[PDB]
Amino acid sequence: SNATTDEHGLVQFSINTTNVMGTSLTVRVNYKDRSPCYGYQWVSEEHEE
Amino acid sequence: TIQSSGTFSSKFQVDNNNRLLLQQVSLPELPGEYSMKVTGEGCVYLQTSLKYNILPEKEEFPFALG
Amino acid sequence: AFQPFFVELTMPYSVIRGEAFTLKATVLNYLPKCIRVSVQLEASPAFLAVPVEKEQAPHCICANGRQTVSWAVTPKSLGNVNFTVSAEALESQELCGTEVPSVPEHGRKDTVIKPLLVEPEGLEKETTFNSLLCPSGGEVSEELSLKLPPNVVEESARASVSVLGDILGSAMQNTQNLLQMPYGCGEQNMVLFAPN
Amino acid sequence: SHGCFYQQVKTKVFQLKRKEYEMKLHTEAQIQEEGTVVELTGRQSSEIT
Amino acid sequence: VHWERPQKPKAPVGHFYEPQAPSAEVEMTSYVLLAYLTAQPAPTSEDLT
Amino acid sequence: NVSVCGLYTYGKPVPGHVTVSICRKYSDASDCHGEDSQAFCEKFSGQLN
Ligand SMILES: *[C@@H]1O[C@H](CO)[C@@H](O[C@@H]2O[C@H](CO)[C@@H](O)[C@H](O)[C@H]2NC(C)=O)[C@H](O)[C@H]1NC(C)=O
Ligand SMILES: *[C@@H]1O[C@H](CO)[C@@H](O)[C@H](O)[C@H]1NC(C)=O
Ligand SMILES: *[C@@H]1O[C@H](CO)[C@@H](O)[C@H](O)[C@H]1NC(C)=O
Ligand SMILES: *[C@@H]1O[C@H](CO)[C@@H](O)[C@H](O)[C@H]1NC(C)=O
């Protein structure tokens, strides 16, 4: 599910739980990769996930 | 053979020796009514290209608020 | 080669019939004497040129001395067009320097004739057509009607046809280039096997 | 005589990239009529992250 | 003339090296070709163009 | 040492202006889509006598 950052950048996301043993959660504003030219071995940039 | 109404004729021959040879020729008439007539055996790819110049309009007088 | 006193021009290879442009004509003097020059250009009716500093008369140019003038010109004709530039020395004008003999050879005036190219005005554009006529032991025909004269300019319409047989344009390299030795796993084995 | 000094610099000469590490700012003020100079080591750890 | 994938993949995609998407443009175009070239008596003219 | 000399018609000298851009190439920048591969450059302006 998507959401957005408010005046304080807070997001209160709720998830009902009726599922398996362990749940993994992740949140991102960009995708799971350093989108602009990450594979060179001479790069300097990142985006926390 | 390329025949054109304004008495403009042209001929070309294609054989295995000039298999990949490209035979280019100009077309000088603005009005085009070119008729292609091919005979014999073998396929032939005919590519035609035409070119000109435009944009002498698009200068009107609408409101546009100055 | 060389010339003790010459006049060389500068302009690009091609221009447009509509817009205008400047023609830069320079004159170089290598003789020790300093002489005033009368530089001008004979123009044809195929265009229209106007000077920019014609009222002021040149002063003089000594050894290794060069001067330059310009002309705002606009072309009218199409294709290659001749431009003539005539430059010469003058006598009895000892106003710039001390003396001015001004006595060159019989060809004391450099009359250079240089051509320039001009394309038809307006935004250029194209149109294409293609066909595959395959007479398999008989006769075949086709008719191509070329007609696109909306808001166009005369003589800009050019057309051309090309007859060929193109399965050989790229037939040469890759056929020669591939054929390799099979090896590796099943996947790689097929990769190197199937293309052959 | 009144207030404090300001200055806006440009980070182009720094080349904030892969192989150019941290930022040390050594400011040195020389108080007049004494020729007394004093230095301050600051913001060394500016996180070019 | 030719055909590509949906002009650019919609969902978050890319980064390089054709990850889980080899671009398959030459193969699909050739497939279209082979299709056009097939008929029961012999192919027509338009398909050959 | 650096020098610039211009040959002309019959190799005679030519008067004018010159802008020499002596440079070191391939700097710390990543060199892809936003980083200039061009490393340090020194531009000298001379009046060709
Ligand atoms: C204009 O330019 C043309 C070249 O585009 C000149 O044509 C040459 O004229 C000489 C004779 O004066 C011929 O011997 C040459 O064969 C022509 N050109 C070529 C390359 O064959 C022409 O002299 C110039 N002047 C005029 C008045 O047209
Ligand atoms: C995420 O979902 C919301 C609906 O809750 C939608 O408005 C939004 O467009 C979605 N995200 C994107 C990138 O479209
Ligand atoms: C949470 O979602 C589950 C989904 O199956 C649903 O069964 C449950 O009633 C929901 N609880 C709420 C809305 O409190
Ligand atoms: C470089 O120029 C200087 C004078 O400008 C000269 O003395 C020297 O020999 C030249 N060559 C070098 C430094 O290799």
**A42 lies within 8 A of chain D by CB:** yes
In 3-state terms, what secondary structure has residue C128?
A: strand
Enter the DSSP assignment of C188: H
Say how many CA atoms lie within 13 Å of C187 toward its Cβ.
Answer: 0
d(CA A18, CA C133): 69
Instruction: Give the position of tokens 């920048």.
Output: F29
Whose CA is closest to C73, among C12, C4, C7? C12
For residue F32, the distance in angstroms to the closest alpha carbon of chain A comes to 6
Which phi and psi (to 5°) does residue F3 adopt?
-150, 150
For ligand 3, atom 1, name the residue with the nearest CA: A16
In 3-state terms, what secondary structure has residue C157?
A: coil
Q: In terms of C-beta density within 10 A (0-12 exposed, 13-18 middle, 19 or more buried), how is residue C20 classed?
A: middle
Say how many CA atoms lie within 13 Å of C92 toward its Cβ.
Answer: 0
Query: How, if at all, do strands C14-16 and C110-119 pair?
Result: parallel
In 3-state terms, what secondary structure has residue F20?
A: strand
Q: How many CB atoms lie within 10 A of CB D22?
A: 10
In 3-state terms, what secondary structure has residue C167?
A: helix
Question: CA-CA-CA-CA torsion for F5, F11, F14, F17, nearest 10 degrees?
Answer: -30
**E14 lies within 8 A of chain A by CB:** yes
Residue C77: both structure tokens together: 């004709």
Residue of E nearest to C131 (CA): E49
Q: Kindly give the distance from the C-alpha atom of residue C163 to the centroid of ligand 1, in angstroms, as a whole number.
A: 33
Question: Is the CB of residue C178 less than 8 Å from the CB of residue B27?
Answer: no
Q: How many CB atoms lie within 10 A of CB C159?
A: 21
Q: Kindly give the distance from the C-alpha atom of residue F14 to the centroid of ligand 4, in angstroms, as a whole number.
A: 24
Q: Which residues have C-beta within 8 Å of that of residue F5, sequence separation ≥ 6?
A: none
Whose CA is closest to F46, among F16, F11, F6? F16
Name the strand (E) or helix (H) holding C118: strand C110-119
Instruction: Give the position of tokens 């004509």.
Output: C25
d(CA C115, CA F32): 45
Name the strand (E) or helix (H) holding E35: helix E25-36
Residue of B nearest to C168 (CA): B20
Say how many CA atoms lie within 13 Å of F32 toward its Cβ.
Answer: 14
Residue C40: both structure tokens together: 């001008």
Residue C110: both structure tokens together: 């450099």
**B8 lies within 8 A of chain C by CB:** no
d(CA C158, CA C3): 43
Please calculate the CA angle C28-F9-C12 and round it to the nearest 5 degrees: 80
CB within 8 Å: C134 and E48: yes
Q: How many CB atoms lie within 10 A of CB C96?
A: 14
d(CA C118, CA C81): 8
- Chain C CB contacts of F15 under 8 Å are 66
- Chain E CB contacts of C130 under 8 Å are 49
Q: Kindly give the distance from the C-alpha atom of residue F26 to the centroid of ligand 1, in angstroms, as a whole number.
A: 52
d(CA C109, CA C103): 11
Q: How many CB atoms lie within 10 A of CB A4?
A: 7
Closest atom of ligand 1 to CA, residue C115: 2
Q: Kindly give the distance from the C-alpha atom of residue F1 to the centroid of ligand 2, in angstroms, as a whole number.
A: 63
Instruction: Give the position of tokens 């603005």.
Output: B30
d(CA C164, CA C131): 11
Say how many CA atoms lie within 13 Å of C8 toward its Cβ.
Answer: 10
Is the CB of A17 within 6 Å of ligand 3? no
- Chain F CB contacts of C10 under 8 Å are none
Is the CB of A16 within 6 Å of ligand 3? yes
Residue type, C45: P
Give the number of the ligand closest to the Cα of residue E10.
Answer: 2
Residues comprising chain A, all counted:
49
For residue F30, the distance in angstroms to the closest alpha carbon of chain A comes to 5
Q: In terms of C-beta density within 10 A (0-12 exposed, 13-18 middle, 19 or more buried), how is residue F25 classed?
A: exposed
Q: Which residues have C-beta within 8 Å of that of residue C149, sequence separation ≥ 6?
A: B30, C157
Resolution, Å (one decimal): 3.6
Q: How many CB atoms lie within 10 A of CB D5?
A: 6
d(CA B54, CA C154): 10
Q: Kindly give the distance from the C-alpha atom of residue F7 to the centroid of ligand 4, in angstroms, as a whole number.
A: 22
Whose CA is closest to E22, among C164, C18, C191, C60? C191
Residues of chain C numbered 102-121 and touching chain B (CB < 8 Å): 120-121
Whose CA is closest to D48, among D16, D5, D10? D16
Residue type, C1: A
Query: Cα F28 vs. chain centroid, distance in angstroms?
Result: 21
CB within 8 Å: E49 and C132: yes
For residue C11, the distance in angstroms to the closest alpha carbon of chain E comes to 41
For residue E1, the distance in angstroms to the closest alpha carbon of chain C comes to 12
d(CA B42, CA B13): 11
**A35 lies within 8 A of chain E by CB:** yes
**Alpha-helix runs per DSSP H in chain B:** none
Method: cryo-EM
Residue type, D13: V
Which phi and psi (to 5°) does residue C27 adopt?
-130, 135
Say how many CA atoms lie within 13 Å of B12 toward its Cβ.
Answer: 21
Enter the DSSP assignment of E36: H
- Could you report how far apart the first and last alpha carbons of chain F are, in Å? 19
- Could you report how far apart the first and last alpha carbons of chain C are, in Å? 62
